[PDB]
Amino acid sequence: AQEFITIGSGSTTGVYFPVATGIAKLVNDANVGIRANARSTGGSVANINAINAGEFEMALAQNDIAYYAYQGCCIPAFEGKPVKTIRALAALYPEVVHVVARKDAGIRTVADLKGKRVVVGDVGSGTEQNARQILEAYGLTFDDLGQAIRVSASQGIQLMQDKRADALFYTVGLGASAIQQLALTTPIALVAVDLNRIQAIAKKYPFYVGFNIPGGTYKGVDVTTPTVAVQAMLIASERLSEETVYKFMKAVFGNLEAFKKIHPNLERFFGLEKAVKGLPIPLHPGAERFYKEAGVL
Numbered sequence: 569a570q571e572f573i574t575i576g577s578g579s580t581t582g583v584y585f586p587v588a589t590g591i592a593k594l595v596n597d598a599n600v601g602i603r604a605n606a607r608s609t610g611g612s613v614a615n616i617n618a619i620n621a622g623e624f625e626m627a628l629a630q631n632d633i634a635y636y637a638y639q640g641c642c643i644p645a646f647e648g649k650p651v652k653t654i655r656a657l658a659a660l661y662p663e664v665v666h667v668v669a670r671k672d673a674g675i676r677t678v679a680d681l682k683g684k685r686v687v688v689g690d691v692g693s694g695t696e697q698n699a700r701q702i703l704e705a706y707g708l709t710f711d712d713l714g715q716a717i718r719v720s721a722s723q724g725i726q727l728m729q730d731k732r733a734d735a736l737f738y739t740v741g742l743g744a745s746a747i748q749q750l751a752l753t754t755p756i757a758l759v760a761v762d763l764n765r766i767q768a769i770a771k772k773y774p775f776y777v778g779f780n781i782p783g784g785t786y787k788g789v790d791v792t793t794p795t796v797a798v799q800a801m802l803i804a805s806e807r808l809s810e811e812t813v814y815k816f817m818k819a820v821f822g823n824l825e826a827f828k829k830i831h832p833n834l835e836r837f838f839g840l841e842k843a844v845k846g847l848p849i850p851l852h853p854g855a856e857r858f859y860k861e862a863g864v865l
């Protein structure tokens with residue numbers, strides 16, 4: 569096809585990557601004049617910066633990060649430096665904050681992370697921002713950690729396996745390959761995140777919702793873990809034409825069955841009505857047209 573669209577995602581072993589890869593496949597197989605490809609990246613912040621720079625046309629990103637970027641606030645990457653070019657295409661599924669600790673590492677709560685070697689997320693990840701915020705809720709900062717490691721998901725679980733890291737954060741949909749792998753190769757435990765503590769700073773970071781990771785989701789973790797979650801979204805540049813986005817939406821979301829087959833999180837959590845519910849940034853004109861046509865707006 570002649571209109572090229574690159575979709576920013578995340579680590580190859582996270583959920584954004586397989587989802588973006590699946591979306592690109594649906595668009596390319598539709599033969600509608602669009603040539604799409606998914607790019608692995610550090611995550612939400614890197615993706616939004618790439619769209620702002622005109623390097624990516626679309627990307628997956630957390631709703632909280634998208635809001636901070638659009639409004640130009642809350643986090644260093646966007647404080648006083650708004651990215652008004654991003655638009656929402658659809659809300660997708662919940663991204664849960666996973667706090668994974670090696671057993672016998674002396675870590676039972678977030679407070680125990682003080683002095684430990686922790687993988688806080690990849691460079692340019694939304695994960696790193698959530699990690700800083702959660703630590704703040706417990707009165708800590710990255711300077712209280714023994715080491716704040718920033719690497720990809722694959723690299724992070726390798727460090728855990730080799731005992732070069734004691735804990736790892738990952739804001740990601742349930743069932744992420746990286747987390748499943750980590751649980752299978754290493755004796756781990758999931759650290760809970762107290763919603764009440766998070767609520768104490770909800771005025772600064774208002775997007776967290778309570779979420780329970782069901783016991784048995786990951787190998788060796790049979791107890792349910794109370795934590796928090798944000799929402800994964802598909803975003804795009806306002807520079808894309810209304811018709812390009814519309815055509816794209818039809819090829820991707822036109823056949824819900826085919827779309828949900830891309831990943832278990834979509835099959836489990838995706839819905840057209842929820843796709844336009846409580847968005848943090850404006851909908852792209854082409855998406856608005858699609859949803860109106862679908863009778864959702």
Ligand SMILES: N[C@@H](CCC(=O)O)C(=O)O
Nearest residue numbers: 578582583584611612694
């Ligand atoms: N939400 C994560 C990425 C999760 C994923 O790759 O599935 C981030 O922005 O860092």
